[PDB]
């Protein structure tokens, strides 16, 4: 039956360079040569959130679409969603269009649907953003969306996450441990907003940045090219790999989930084009995971010609 057809195997990769350079994706290393299926599966499994249209008016009389202004909010949703996926499903979990998915999957996705009731919907984010001094429809930067997600997570008793946003290029281990042992350890979502330069990222940070994607705890990075935010999930050689929210899709009407998965080899852009305003994220399920992450960070001192983007201090 299938024998009389040409399955066009790897058609999706006709848009990817066949190099010996390993492909890193949120802490997993792949070989372009023998793991195209694995690479595509991991990328396609990630929850993808793009601009949406025709959803309930935000605040009753606000926008019914976030096209043109919700880009960083969408990138925030994607990195936080990946944290939820790791927390509820595990980093090893993979999505398949056919096979029935776990109920926890629909719960995670549901939390990002464009409706006021969902924990992390565009409605909840934009509205909570007002309290941070951001009007509905105003563009966000990395820290702002991170701060808004931390406040929204408070109400997510299902995930019961500890969200720490390290300011001033400093990660205080004492504060983090105190947070995770409060209300024995709450899975940790660590977000580090950074400004690696004025207009460009100093070459000195490049290798350190790459290594941020090579840790088991890696959630990726949010930032972008000027006027185009992206959720960076890894890299290959000198190019960052990412998911792009700049595509307007109809609000989902049931949940059919094909539109929340980017089933294509990821978009690429040279690391040289990345703007200096970013937020790096890490997920530490247990205290042991956090301790391992701390070790991962310290080991970076072994990077030749590289400089640290942030520093770990005890208190």
């Amino acid at each position: 039956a299938t024998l009389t057809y040409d399955t066009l195997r790897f058609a999706e990769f006709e848009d990817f360079p066949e190099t010996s350079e390993p492909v890193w994706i949120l802490g997993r290393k792949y070989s372009i040569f023998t793991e195209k299926d694995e690479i595509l599966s991991d990328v396609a499994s990630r929850l993808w959130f793009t601009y949406r249209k025709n959803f309930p008016a935000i605040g009753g009389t606000g926008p019914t679409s976030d096209t043109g202004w919700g880009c960083m909010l969408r990138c925030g949703q994607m990195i936080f969603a990946q944290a939820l996926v790791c927390r509820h499903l595990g980093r090893d979990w993979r999505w398949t269009q056919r096979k029935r998915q776990p109920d926890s999957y629909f719960s995670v996705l549901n939390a990002f649907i464009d409706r006021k009731d969902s924990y992390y919907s565009i409605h909840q984010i934009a509205q909570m953003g007002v309290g941070e001094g951001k009007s509905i429809g105003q563009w966000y930067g990395p820290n702002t969306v991170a701060q808004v997600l931390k406040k929204l997570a408070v109400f997510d008793t299902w995930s019961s996450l500890a969200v720490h946003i390290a300011m001033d290029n400093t990660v205080v281990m004492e504060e983090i441990r105190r947070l995770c042992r409060t209300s024995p350890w709450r899975p940790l979502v660590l977000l580090i907003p950074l400004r690696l330069g004025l207009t460009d990222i100093n070459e000195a940070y490049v290798e350190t940045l790459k290594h941020c994607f090579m840790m088991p705890q890696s959630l990726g990075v949010i930032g972008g090219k000027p006027n185009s935010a992206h959720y960076f999930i890894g890299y290959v050689g000198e190019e960052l790999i990412y998911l792009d929210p700049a595509t307007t899709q109809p609000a989902v009407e049931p949940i059919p989930d094909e539109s929340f998965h980017c089933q294509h080899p990821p978009c690429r852009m040279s690391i040289a084009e990345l703007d200096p305003s970013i937020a790096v994220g890490f997920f530490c399920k247990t205290e042991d995971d956090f301790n391992d992450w701390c070790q991962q960070v310290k080991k970076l001192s072994l990077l030749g010609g590289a400089l640290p983007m942030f520093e770990l201090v005890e208190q």
Partner: protein, 118 residues
């Protein structure tokens, strides 16, 4: 107009000469909002005389206070285009390796770029 545009090179050199002679244990620092930064407020003053023992961590805190910023608002202090390697680093050491030809140590503060499309 930036500090360097309001005071001439020779004038700045002279400023430093006097201040260093009058306060040998203080570092003359110019701190301004990055020309590309528009979200963070501007300071009523741009010239600071900082005890040389003050570290970047403390400097970041006082400027945040001066700008009346909340702890969760993004703020970065950059020297010669880069972030502070270590926040425990004394301003005296930063001055030593990063000072301008005119004798002043320059710094600009900024938050983060925002994003959106079309």
């Amino acid at each position: 107009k930036t500090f360097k545009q309001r005071r001439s090179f020779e004038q700045r050199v002279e400023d430093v000469r006097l201040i260093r002679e009058q306060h040998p244990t203080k570092i003359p620092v110019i701190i301004e909002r990055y020309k590309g930064e528009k979200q963070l407020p501007v300071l009523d003053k741009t010239k600071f005389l900082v005890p040389d023992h003050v570290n970047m961590s403390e400097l970041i805190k006082i400027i945040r206070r001066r700008l009346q910023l909340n702890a969760n608002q993004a703020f970065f202090l950059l020297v010669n285009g880069h972030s502070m390697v270590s926040v425990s680093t004394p301003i005296s050491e930063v001055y030593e390796s990063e000072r301008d030809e005119d004798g002043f140590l320059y710094m600009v503060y900024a938050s983060q770029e925002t994003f959106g499309t079309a």
